[PDB]
Structure formats: C-alpha cells, structure tokens
Design a protein around this ligand. Structure first.
Ligand SMILES: [K+]
Ligand SMILES: [K+]
Ligand SMILES: [K+]
Ligand SMILES: [Mg+2]
Ligand SMILES: [Mg+2]
Ligand SMILES: [Mg+2]
Ligand SMILES: [Mg+2]
Ligand SMILES: [Mg+2]
Ligand SMILES: [Mg+2]
Ligand SMILES: [Mg+2]
Ligand SMILES: [Mg+2]
Ligand SMILES: [Mg+2]
Ligand SMILES: [Mg+2]
Ligand SMILES: [Mg+2]
Ligand SMILES: [Mg+2]
Lengths: 202, 252, 56, 78, 85
RNA sequence: UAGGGAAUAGUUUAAAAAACAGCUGACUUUCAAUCAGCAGAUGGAGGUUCAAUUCCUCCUUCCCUAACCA
RNA sequence: CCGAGCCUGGUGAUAGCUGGUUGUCCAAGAUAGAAUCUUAGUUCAACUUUAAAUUUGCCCACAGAACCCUCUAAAUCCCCUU
RNA sequence: AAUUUAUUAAUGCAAACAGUACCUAACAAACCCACAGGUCCUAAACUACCAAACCUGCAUUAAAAAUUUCGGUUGGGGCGACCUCGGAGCAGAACCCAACCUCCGAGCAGUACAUGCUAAGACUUCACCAGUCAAAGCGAACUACUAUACUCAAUUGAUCCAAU
C-alpha cells in the first residue's frame, strides 16, 4: 500500500464542513510503500500433521505465503481465533486426562519416520573384547544415525552380542510408537579411515 | 572490519543453543540446538564416552576455543602466543628451546634456566647450513644482527619483539616454556584455538581449574572490555565430539 | 582571488566561559596562543586556536 | 545545576590560568631565542653555500638535514 | 492521481504521478455460500481477511465504505440472505 | 570544506628487504644489455617506552567519498 | 492569408507601445541627481500644488577659507548692516 | 542553453510465486589384532543451493520529448571595447559637474590581540541603502615607542537561504 502526505498545508475546515482543496493540495510525497516492510508471520492452529509441525492443536507461526497458499486452503490449519483456541485447548485437557489418547510431538513424528527407514552400523573394535549394552548402542545412534536415544528406551535382542553380525533394536519413541530398526555390527573404523577408504575412492 | 571476518563473528553468535534435554525421550539432534553445557558435567561426560567408545583411559583433551581474536576497534588485533603454565600441567614433557647468545654472560642464564640449545655463531651457522628443529627461539638484542641470517630460513619464526622474544632478559619465554604450554594460533585466522588442557584421567576439578587459567591466559592478548574476546568453547577429547561449554560465567 | 597566504581561525577562551573571537594568521605558521581580554571574566586570559573558519 | 556547573568549570579553569600565563610567557621568550639562533645559523650556512655553488634546493636541503641529524645524534646518546 | 516534485524538491518541476496497487488473483472459499471464487485482490485485502478470521467474517464485518467493491456488497447480500432465511 | 585512508632510498614495492634509476667501473667500434661494486630511506613536530616504520597526538601534502547551496 | 487548420470557451488574455478621453470660468505651475535586465518605464530625491504651524528668508561689511604647481582667471563660499 | 523524466524501453532491488540438496584426501614411530582393522599423537566446528514470466513500488541508464530564456551601454545595430572601487586633469579659488574624454591604480599586505564596552555632538558621494569622525564615561594601558577609534587611497557584495 502506498502511503502519501501533502506538501502543502490544508487550512482547517472546522466542525461540520468539508476542507477547501486547492490544486496545490494534489502534490504528494511518498511516505512509505508497505510492500517493502519486513514480513510478519501468521499464527495458525494446526489440524492435521505436517512435516514442519504436526501436533494437532499446536499454535504455529508460519510465513504468510505458506499459511495462505497451502495450510488454510486445504484445511490443514485454522485461524488462531479466540473461538478456535478455546476448542483446541479443551481437547488438550481431554487428551491429558480423558479417554483421548496421547499423540507424538512434532519431533516425535519426524524421528519415527526416520527410524522406520534407517539401519544402524554399530562399529565395534576388534582388539578389545566388547559386550553390546543399551548404553553403548545408544551412543552409536548419536554418532552414526544422529539420533539422540535415551538408554532406557532401547530394547536389545537380550542375547549377549560379542561377535560381528546382524540383530534388531526395538526403539520406543516417547513411549507410544515402538520401531524395530535393523542392526549391523561391523568392525569399527575410524572416521578418517572410513571416509578416505570408500567415500574418496568411489 | 572485513565483511567476511565480521559476518562470521555475527553468524557464530547466531547459532542457537538450549538448556536441558528436551521433553522428548528420543529426538533427532537436528531438531534441537546444542544442549550440553556445564564444565563439570562436560568432563564427566567425556569420561562416559571413553567407556562406551573403548579407548585409552588417558587422552589429550584438545579444547578448541572460538575466541573473538579480533574486533577491538574497526582495526583487528593480531595473533600472538601468551605462554603460561596451567595449575596442574599434564603429563606431557616438552623441553625444546633454542637460545642465541654469543660471548655474553646470558649463555649461563640461558642454560641455568633450562635451555635445551644455547650457542652463538656456531649455533646460528648450524641452523643455516644444516637442518635443526626447535619449538621456539629467543635471542638477545646483541645477537639479532647476526641472527638475521636465519630470518629467511625460519620463515618469520625467528625471534621478534612482537612476541617478546628479543630482550636482555631471556627468561620471558625460556624459563616458563618447559612448564608452560603454548597457546598456539590458527593458520587460517578464523579465531579457533586448538590448545590441549589436560589428560582424560585428570580429576574434573583439576581440569576445571586448568580451563579457567587458560581463559585469563587467552584474554591476555586483548584484555580490553571494549570488545568481547570469547564467543564459544568446544571441549573435545581426542576421540570425541566437541561440547559447547557455558563459559560465560568463567569469562571474567 | 590571489594566493591564499592567510587564514581565519577561531580563538577559544581557556577560561571555560566559551567566549570566542576570530583572528587572522599565516597558514604556514603554528597555531596561535594569545592573551586576549575575556569579557565574561573581565580580565585577560589565554586563548587557543581550535578551528579554521575560512581561507583568506 | 547547569549554572552551578558552569561557574565551577570557570572557577577551576581560572585558578590554573595564572600558572598557564607564566608558562606561555616563557615559551614566547624561548621562541624569540630560538628564532635568533636559526636566523644566525641558517643564513651563514645557506649564504656561504649559495655563493660557492651558483653565486638552491640541494645545498639548503643538506644543511637543513645535517643540522637535524646532529641534534638527533645527541638525542640518541640520551 | 496526484502530483509530485522532482527529486522531492519544491523548487523543481511538478509532475503528474499515479500510484497503482499491486493486484493478485487468488481463490477464496465461502462457508456460508459453500463456493469458491477467483477474485483479484491486494495484499491489504489478504491481511484484512486474516484479521477477520476468514472471508465470510471480512465480508460481513466490513462496512460498504471500506469494501469499496460492488462484488463485495453482492457477496454480503448473498451471505445475509442465507443467514436470514 | 566534511569525514575515511595514506605518507619508506631519486623511482616503485616489501616487513628496515629487493627492483629500477644514478651509476664508479669492466665488457661491447658506438649504445643497449650483462657482471661486479658503491651510494642511498622510515612527510614534519611532540610525547610514552631502555629501545617506536611497528602506541598515541597535532600540523603539512595527496587520495577517496560526499559536498561546493545562497 | 497553415513555420501549422477552424470554431467556441478560459477572455473585458496582456500590451513600460500607438491612438482616443465630452460643460463654463479663475488661479498657482519648467526640471540638480541616484538606482534599476535600466535608459520608450519606474522608485527615491529635486521641482511643482494645497492646508497648517511659527520665524526668519533673500539681498549682503569687515574679518576669514593651502600648500604642492604654470594660465598669478571671471568668480564662489561665509556674512552683520541695509 | 537551463530545468525535468511524468511517459516509453532496458537493467537492478523489493514485492509475488517453487522447492531442491545437505560433503570424503588416511597411512601403525610403538603396540594390538587370525582377518578386516584397531590403541596412542585430535574422530571438532560448520548447513548450503535456491523459483521462468506478467503485474506493482523504488532506483539507474537511454530514447523521445516537454517547459522557459537568450543582459545592458553604444554618435543606428552588429563586431570590437566597456560595466564595481580609488587618485589626478578637464573642473585654476566652498561644494557639485559629463563624453566609447585624457592618465595612473585597487579586488591586498603588514603589525596588534582592550582593532574591549559604552555614549554627547556631527559628516555624508547629491534619494534610500551603505559609508565616516568622534568628547565624556566603564574597563585597561602608562611611568614621554609623535601613547587609548592601529598602518594603508581604493583593497569590496544587500535580502532570503545554508552551515554552526
Ligand atoms: K520601457
Ligand atoms: K504616433
Ligand atoms: K551618427
Ligand atoms: Mg483555410
Ligand atoms: Mg489592454
Ligand atoms: Mg498664472
Ligand atoms: Mg539586475
Ligand atoms: Mg530615464
Ligand atoms: Mg544673513
Ligand atoms: Mg540571463
Ligand atoms: Mg541595445
Ligand atoms: Mg557603432
Ligand atoms: Mg561583443
Ligand atoms: Mg546624503
Ligand atoms: Mg575618550
């Protein structure tokens, strides 16, 4: 929006009268064009799940382009009006205490999708005798797959693993979804050696 | 303030960071900022990783410090090497120092203070005509004219007044070097300083004290309150990832 | 219209009163320090040149 | 407050003035004695040089430089 | 439709100048009418619709002098007639 | 005028060095080139520091950028 | 009557330029200059006209007003009296 | 020639509108490990690309035009010359006095730093504007540098506005 102001003063008209406009009062200066202003975010309440944010009832501040051109037209989100906030707020209470079941958080859904399609390379050193336990296996998610897994969540095959081979790790994400990821125990190779050996070679 | 250098300083400050583990039990690292802070917990955690990742109980903790070594004024400071011994020097033994002093009583003071290589023309000629390696060099003003021969050989590593390595009193760097540990500087001058602090087996409190000593040691170059000298601190073991310490309380 | 041999400068009182007067000096010579009467304090005080007004 | 600060500033600046004048007066006398020294020395050296060579930038520059060196050599000894 | 001074200096030439709004074709859905409309709008209209929490609220809340559109007033009569009946 | 930046041998650069010029010569018919030597500098002033091109300050000259309206 | 048509309107365009400006009778009444895109005009002085106030105006005796330089000019200024 | 780019075209930015990819140069000196490889002497940190047009706003460069003016003096005008200020002659003796008349100059410099303040009475370039000289007084200076409105002939520029 173009906002303008007059160069010349307009004489006061008084109460109940229209201003007397000379032709000099048509000369304007551009005060501001509001399209050049810093863009503000649009506050929406989500309905379905989206990769960025997916917790139904989560107050999200998105770019006006995203909300207007995708979320709102398709119904994935609704306006954060006082009436909508009340309805979604009430539903939250029921989920916490009522019959309504609890649902993954925004990050929980992202991890579950990643955990469904990933394989862990549990690199173990040959020299030192090693026994695989939840704590050690948890460390490899951080290093290899980049997932930060709590030690208690991991459920190992319960058979002591001291030999290179394949097994299965059952990961529980926030206590609701249990994912079983393939486990590939392999001889440990240092980061520099492994990258130079294969990544550089091929 | 060159755009690239100053912009990165703004960018590194921008990197978000958070306190405490997120509510979610299992969370992708990408989804949340850096979290681990406290220096005490950091050392305790580095010991934990050593057990999980089977490795030597004693490892060099190569603390890397992204210390704002620039932007005092719009003119940036320069990289130097303030050498000071930590409260508990780790078990590494380093005693490599060359002292240039010819036909002077300083020859005695040099060796008396633990000089490894002390000599005059004979020592200077040996450096030019034959290969020899020393960690740091010192020379008295009287020998600087003769020592100029090795200026080209040492590629600006020869003694300079800027590094306080030219003076009648040699023990500035000579004496403190053996117990002292050099605060080397980056080659790219990106402001990250790789400086070992302690062995992994050193007690947390001793490593914590060793950390604080360096904080004052590093600010010695520019201890002015005009420009902040410290931005981030990554305490990493030899075979572990760096952890973002909460160094703000320990800065002053 | 001719070679600029002199310049006009502002002499500021050292008494802190802020009284100023303009004097002409040679461009090449050093900054003037003069003993000039200051009306605010009503006695002669040392003045020191601070700025160059214009070229004469 | 503004009035009190201005009067205090003037009073302080005016208590130092008596000594300032003494220093200024001495500088004038010192400058009078320095100009005489220059008037004498520069003229003699420059005049003799000009008479010999050419009956004068090069010669003047030399004498205007060596004299400075002599003063510096004394400062180096200090 | 107005005038301007060249270089924003009153002592310079006075020139004619027209400032036009940036126009966009967007699709909106009306709950009361259960129909989608492709309408030319400005970024201001989109902001006003967001502040009203939907097209229907914007059409019903906005007075005639602020809508400044015969089509907008036709939508209002349509929406009001469905609510009245 | 305004701030920013800059000032090194006669000249142009470097972190107190090299290159050219001046070259004193040698050698080329002549001259260039080439070889070996020799002279050569930290704009000016003041101060700190044992020591300041390398810390600071004022002034001169020049550049840059923006003025240079009435 | 095209160096850019014609008509109406703005329009009683503007013109320091030219022309014109209507009954009777009497009276006073001519002229240093300055500035100005100003010298075909203006504004201020000067002159001129009317009314009012109160007091000198004009004509002029002595005495008096420069050296430097050549015409040692005709004269002027000042000025009581009358 | 001065002023201008609204208009037209081009270019840049913003506005508007998709997503796409997330980065590898060991090497054991010693020791371990049947291998494949590991322990020590660092295995950190770090996201980067990035949406064609039309339209709208703001800039820049062009094109094509628009608006307005084109000083005076002058033995007619043009050309040449001249245009403000001071000294001398013409103008012999109070003042004043012209020519595209006759001659010479000025657009500073130097010394002070009370070239501080204030105030009777006067002069005046024929108006106005501007310009000029000043007793006393205040404050200084002073113990006789022809001293307290510097020397100098002209040595210069109104109002608005701008900088402070
Ligand atoms: K006229
Ligand atoms: K006629
Ligand atoms: K004639
Ligand atoms: Mg016709
Ligand atoms: Mg008419
Ligand atoms: Mg008559
Ligand atoms: Mg004029
Ligand atoms: Mg006339
Ligand atoms: Mg009489
Ligand atoms: Mg003109
Ligand atoms: Mg004419
Ligand atoms: Mg003629
Ligand atoms: Mg002419
Ligand atoms: Mg007069
Ligand atoms: Mg007097």
């Amino acid at each position: 929006t173009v906002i303008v102001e007059r160069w010349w003063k307009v004489p006061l008209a008084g109460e109940g009268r229209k201003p007397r406009l000379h032709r000099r009062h048509r000369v304007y200066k551009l005060v501001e064009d509001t399209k050049h202003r810093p863009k503000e975010n649009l506050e929406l309440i989500l309905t379905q799940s989206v990769e960025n944010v997916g917790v139904r009832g989560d107050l999200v501040s998105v770019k006006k382009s995203l909300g207007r051109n995708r979320l709102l037209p398709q119904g994935l989100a609704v306006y954060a009006s006082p009436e909508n906030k009340k309805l979604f707020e009430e539903e939250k209470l029921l989920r916490q205490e009522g019959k309504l079941e609890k649902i993954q958080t925004k990050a929980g859904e992202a991890t579950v999708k990643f955990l469904k399609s990933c394989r862990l390379e549990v690199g173990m050193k040959n020299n030192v005798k090693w026994e695989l336990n939840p704590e050690i296996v948890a460390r490899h998610f951080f290093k290899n797959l980049g997932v930060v897994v709590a030690p208690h969540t991991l459920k190992l095959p319960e058979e002591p693993i001291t030999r290179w081979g394949e097994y299965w790790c059952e990961v529980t994400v926030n206590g609701l979804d249990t994912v079983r990821v393939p486990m590939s125990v392999v001889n440990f190779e240092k980061p520099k050696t492994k990258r130079y050996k294969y990544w550089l070679a091929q | 303030t060159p755009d690239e250098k100053k912009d990165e300083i703004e960018k590194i400050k921008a990197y978000p960071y958070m306190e405490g583990e997120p509510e979610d039990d299992v969370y992708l690292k990408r989804l949340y900022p850096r979290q681990i802070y406290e220096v005490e917990k950091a050392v305790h955690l580095l010991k934990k990783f050593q057990i999980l990742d089977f490795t030597s109980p004693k490892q060099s903790v190569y603390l890397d410090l992204t210390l704002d070594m620039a932007l005092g004024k719009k003119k940036n400071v320069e990289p130097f090497t303030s050498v000071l011994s930590l409260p508990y020097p780790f078990a590494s033994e380093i005693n490599k120092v060359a002292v240039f002093t010819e036909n002077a009583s300083e020859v005695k003071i040099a060796e008396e203070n633990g000089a490894a290589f002390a000599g005059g023309t004979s020592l200077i000629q040996k450096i030019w005509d034959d290969e020899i390696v020393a960690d740091f060099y010192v020379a008295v003003p009287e020998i600087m004219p003769e020592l100029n021969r090795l200026r080209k050989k040492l590629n600006k590593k020869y003694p300079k007044l800027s590094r306080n390595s030219i003076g009648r009193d040699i023990p500035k760097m000579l004496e403190l070097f053996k117990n002292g540990h050099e605060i080397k500087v980056d080659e790219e001058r990106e402001n990250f300083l790789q400086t070992k602090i302690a062995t992994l087996d050193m007690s947390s409190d001793q490593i914590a004290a060793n950390l604080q000593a360096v904080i004052n040691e590093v600010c010695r170059h520019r201890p002015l309150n005009l420009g902040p000298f410290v931005v981030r601190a990554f305490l990493r073991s030899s075979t572990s990832e760096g952890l973002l310490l909460k160094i703000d309380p320990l800065l002053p | 219209k001719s070679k600029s041999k002199n310049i006009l400068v502002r002499m500021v009182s050292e008494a802190g009163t802020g009284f100023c007067f303009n004097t002409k000096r040679n461009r090449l010579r050093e900054k003037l320090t003069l003993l000039h009467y200051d009306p605010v304090v009503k006695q002669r005080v040392l003045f020191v040149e601070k700025k160059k007004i214009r070229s004469l | 407050q503004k009035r009190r600060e201005r009067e205090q500033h003037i009073a302080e600046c005016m208590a130092k003035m008596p000594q300032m004048i003494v220093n200024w007066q001495q500088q004038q006398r010192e400058n009078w004695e320095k100009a005489q020294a220059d008037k004498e020395r520069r003229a003699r050296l420059q005049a003799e040089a000009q008479e010999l060579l050419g009956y004068v930038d090069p010669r003047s520059a030399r004498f205007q430089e060596l004299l400075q060196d002599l003063e510096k050599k004394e400062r180096k000894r200090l | 439709l107005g005038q301007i001074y060249a270089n924003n200096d009153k002592l310079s030439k006075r020139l004619k100048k027209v400032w036009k709004p940036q126009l966009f074709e967007r699709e909106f859905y009306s709950e009361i009418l259960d129909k989608k409309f492709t309408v030319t709008v400005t970024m201001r209209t989109l902001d006003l619709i967001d502040e009203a929490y939907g097209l229907d609220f914007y059409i019903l809340k906005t007075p005639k002098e602020d809508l400044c559109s015969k089509f907008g007033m036709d939508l209002k009569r349509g929406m009001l007639l469905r609510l009245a009946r």
